[PDB]
């Protein structure tokens, strides 16, 4: 786990991601249901990042996966979407922030990455999913 | 000012211009590789520049006068080659590029000329003699 | 189960959903077959909601899933389609409304959501399937 | 089983359906075959109905599934394609009509329906398959 | 098995079908392998017929499946592609014709058919696969 | 210079030109098989040349004067054939290719002519008599 | 030369031409079934010919003068039929084909005529009376 | 011959024509349901005819003169309705169909008129009064 | 009759018209939600009407004269807003709608004006003052 | 009123206008990010505004007069860059944006000029000097 | 196995095919790998042939599959791509040619073929894969 | 393992490939989870090479797979993307290069290749996935 950097600045339009829950459920077949939640929290689970710049940006991006990545390190993630609460219901969010200001430490959900060449200097990679391990 | 009579396309066989050369037009292109990241100081579109492929296309019009350079283009079309073509710009200079002979067409009417268009496109790296 | 709010007002064209019937069935290989249902109601089972507004609407929408949501709470749902009966047959609907005026309390059919950024201010999420648990 | 009504009048272009058979078959591997038919009849098996009108037509259509439907009732079906025989071969059809004049009593082949909103007043649902239980 | 009629005349462009060979095969993992076939003929295996005419043609076509069809009858099939031999190799075809002049008695490879209505008079059905059972 | 009256399309029956031949235009084509590898000395588009298919298309306009060669084209259209067609270029020579009769059309107005367009396209390998 | 007044489209009711027939144009087509095998003596496109479907389309313009043949076309459109239509070519002869009434349109301005276009297309096998 | 001043589109409120009616054009359509079976006596395209949907479209141009019938069309557009519209053909008669008000547009220049186009399309079954 | 000088588009800052307003054109639309059931009394297309979305688009042309209302549109474009816009119809009245500033363009030649087009489209519910 | 001679595009090397500048046209754009929720007070289309990307495109026409600024654009095209470009509006002021050199073309006829079009598009965030 | 003919001349653009190997592989999970090859040769494995000519060419093509084909015969195959060696590496190809001049005897990889009609005289079939059995 | 050549020069736009990490993972259903990798390197795992030139280039490319290839040999691979370190984090890459200057010896991830003919001279093959075995 690191505190190394946010990310390369570029993120394409389509960087999707939202919180998860396990919340297993029985669906009582002759009436309503009853369902349990063991979390009290949520994995933010950001997906579908895309790097799109010159090939000068690519070699600092492929080794972003490699050098400080490996598999098992932080690389605090920037959200385009210390405790934050959500007060728009009379309920509350009250979800903690271990890192400062929406920085949500994560890890990539990939055994490999796949960078493509689109033109003499175009570097693309279609997806880098994350799940924000604590 | 520069005379339009000065800019000349010319074939190899050593370079000679074709006979009917009524209107000619070299046209360059680049496909504008859009690199629009989410950040941009006013939401402006950002572009990369040098990553884009770049091209050239020559469209020569003229009246069919039989010349060896005009017969050459037919031979370039049937025996499909990509030889060196050369286009002068009056005070810039020549281009001297490899092109192909993409589409030619001969036309004639009941009263007018034997006319022809000659459309070419880039086939390699170009040059500039200054 | 809550009585908190309807929803964000915006719903895209394509918000699908219609009643779901157990309809336990035998399918005799001879021919005609019998069947019965143990509900005497119908889960309305609304799907394919889409939030589309500015990013100011997104942070009150992502924590809509989180804060009063979790998984297991009401958030009464607005239908663009106290007892209502349906009299267009000589049979009857006679289906109850626990909440007032088509408000059908539900829950989202998702372990996670997936909000996307499509431009400097565009917030999109493709689907939030519900089932109106009693 | 009812005798309630035909259907809403509207049916989109593409309402497909044709008769079935079980006719299990052995395909004797070193020559021709031999095959048995236990029916002497055919399930007409109409599919792919689409309701397309205003939202005023939708509430009399969603409860068509619900009120006289449930799961297990008739709602005699209108064919755009008392005993009818088919004499264009020297064989015969001789297929009975329990209901009058091509009315083929059926049931919907769905646990749920799915009505969509296409515009301020457009109501669509893509499919309602039937099999004509006796 | 019948001798009733060829078919409705109409067949759309795309009526595919060609001979099917048992071709029991061993596929030795070393390399080359041997094989043999027990037919000494070839099931012609025609597929993808389409009826396209008015709705007047449809009721003589839906009961073509039903009346003389059922599942297990002939209805001699017309090929747009008494013993015929094939002499373009020094080998020979020498394949028999039980029926006269390319009439290849078949059966449909379907438990059901599916006729569609595409306009006030348009009748379509996408496929009727046969296999020419002897 | 070459007279537009000289370039003539002509049918077989032995070759004779059609009657109304107001404007005619043989048009050749090639689809430009793009072979753009990642390497290219300036990022220029590279082309292969001889791999491209090559075509010819004849568009003849004219006024309907009844001739046996004009009746022949109707017979070529109804009995759909691909016979030999021949187009002179004034000082080049003939082409002598197999074409088809892709689309013809007869037109007339309340005051003008019986006119016709006649559009043809290549059907085989062409030639050149020089 | 042939007069454009001679080529006439005409409806059945027995055949009579329509009233406003300012400009008419029968147009035939074939879709050119490309059969381009890998072998071809110069890489030329090969075509099959007779495999292609063939069509006909009639586009008649004119000014709305009320006639029974003009009322007939409205009745052919509302009661949608495909009756026999017949188009003379001056010195060729008639065509006598089954067509439909694909799209008609009536138009009028604040100062001009009641005018109409009448677009037809082939519906069956055609003929030729010579 | 028929005067173009005679053919008139008109709204309901009882029917009155709109004020600026510089050029108007009812246009009918059918989508030509192609029924091309493999058999056809010359490979001709066969069509069904009556299976095709049929339509109507009205495109009215004019100069903005304020009238109650001109205000009506704005009210028909904002309160989106499909009321009865009626278009005379000079010597045929009226049409009297339900249409909608698909797209209208008001235009003005620094020197010219307040002008408007008014585009309508069919919304139901039409008629004909003869 | 109504003067084209009377219909005026105008920005907020309180409403003032822009300087170069050579030609302007409000244009409304509806997408015509086709509801064509199998039954229809003649096979006619049936439409729903009020289900269709409805729009408005303003295309203003003019010559670049510097005004505060002309500077306002640049500020509306860079600071991308959807403010209230208002378009008079001479004897109808104003529209007073929220629009955006979809595409503007400034143009100039070696001999002519500094000219500009200004294209807008609807952004909300519109109005009508009568 | 503003003279069209005043609005000038100019390259860097420090800024100088190009030689043949017969017609030039900066053109801005935005793609109009449609945010049409089901609710809308009359079924009107709602738009977001500031979410849309925004662009600029320069299309300069002119006659080829050899200048260092004209040679610069060739060097900008071959050595593909995105340098700063600057376009004056007469009484607004300059723009001073990074653009690329998307497509240029040189043309000449048998009797006319050596002419050229020069098409550019936005490559970054723009400015405005007022 | 035959020596009968090459093939019909026509082959569409897209006639794909290249050599095979079994070369089973273990991928030692904590380092590099080691892998075995039992062939010393390669199955050329040509696929995706397409016949496209008139219907006069079709009846000499459908019985090409049938008459000299059956399943288990040669029909020497023409490559648009006596021992041939490949000397562009310092290694060697040294691959034998049992037939003369790139003629690669094969067999079709099909239990059935599927010829289509595309127009009054157009005959098409999408694929005839082969593997070049010795 | 060879040192024979790089490759044919041509590679189409789309030659994808990036490092692949074992990343053995436990995924505790509670929440956060631990992980470790046994490589201390990363298989570069390049894919989607395409040869596109004349047919003169094809016969030196199909036997590139065959002659020095087989399955189990090196053919050092050129990357369009002696020890190289990556210093953009305060961590390090420090990944070795057994071959000089980005030459990454690999092997193709294919039992067969598939070269296509697209025109009189066009030679194409869609993919040659490698993994850079040490």
Numbering used by the authors:
A (entry chain C), C (entry chain D), D (entry chain C), E (entry chain D), K (entry chain C), L (entry chain D): 2 to 82, 157 to 209
B (entry chain A), F (entry chain B), G (entry chain A), H (entry chain B), I (entry chain A), J (entry chain B): 3 to 15, 20 to 136
What did the original publication write about this model?
Gene transfer agents (GTAs) are DNA-containing phage-like particles produced by some species of bacteria and archaea. The genes encoding proteins that form Rhodobacter capsulatus GTA particles (RcGTA) are derived from phage DNA, which has been integrated into the bacterial genome. Here, we use cryo-electron microscopy (cryo-EM) to determine the structures of RcGTA before and after DNA ejection, and to visualize the interactions of RcGTA with R. capsulatus cells. Particles of RcGTA have heads with a diameter of 38-nm and 49-nm long tails.
The structures of the stopper, tail terminator and tail tube proteins have been determined to a resolution of 3.6 Å, and that of the distal tail protein to 4.0 Å. The attachment of distal tail proteins to tail tube proteins is enabled by the long loop of the tail tube protein, which interacts with the β2-core α-helix loop and short loop of the distal tail protein. The long loop of the tail tube protein mediates interactions between the tail tube proteins from successive discs and between the tail tube protein and distal tail protein. The insertion domain of the distal tail protein was resolved to a resolution of 5 Å and can adopt several conformations, as seen in two-dimensional class averages of RcGTA tails. The insertion domain of this RcGTA protein is homologous to that from the distal tail protein of phage T5, which has an oligosaccharide-binding fold. Therefore, it is possible that the insertion domain enables the binding of RcGTA particles to a sugar receptor at the cell surface of R. capsulatus, and flexibility of the domain may facilitate binding. Attachment of the RcGTA baseplate to the tail is enabled by the binding of the attachment domain of the hub protein and central domain of the megatron protein to the N-terminal Ala2, long loops, and C-terminal Arg209 of the distal tail proteins. The mismatch between the six-fold symmetry of the tail and threefold symmetry of the baseplate is resolved by the different conformations of residues from the long loops of odd and even subunits of distal tail proteins, which enable them to interact with hub and megatron proteins, respectively.
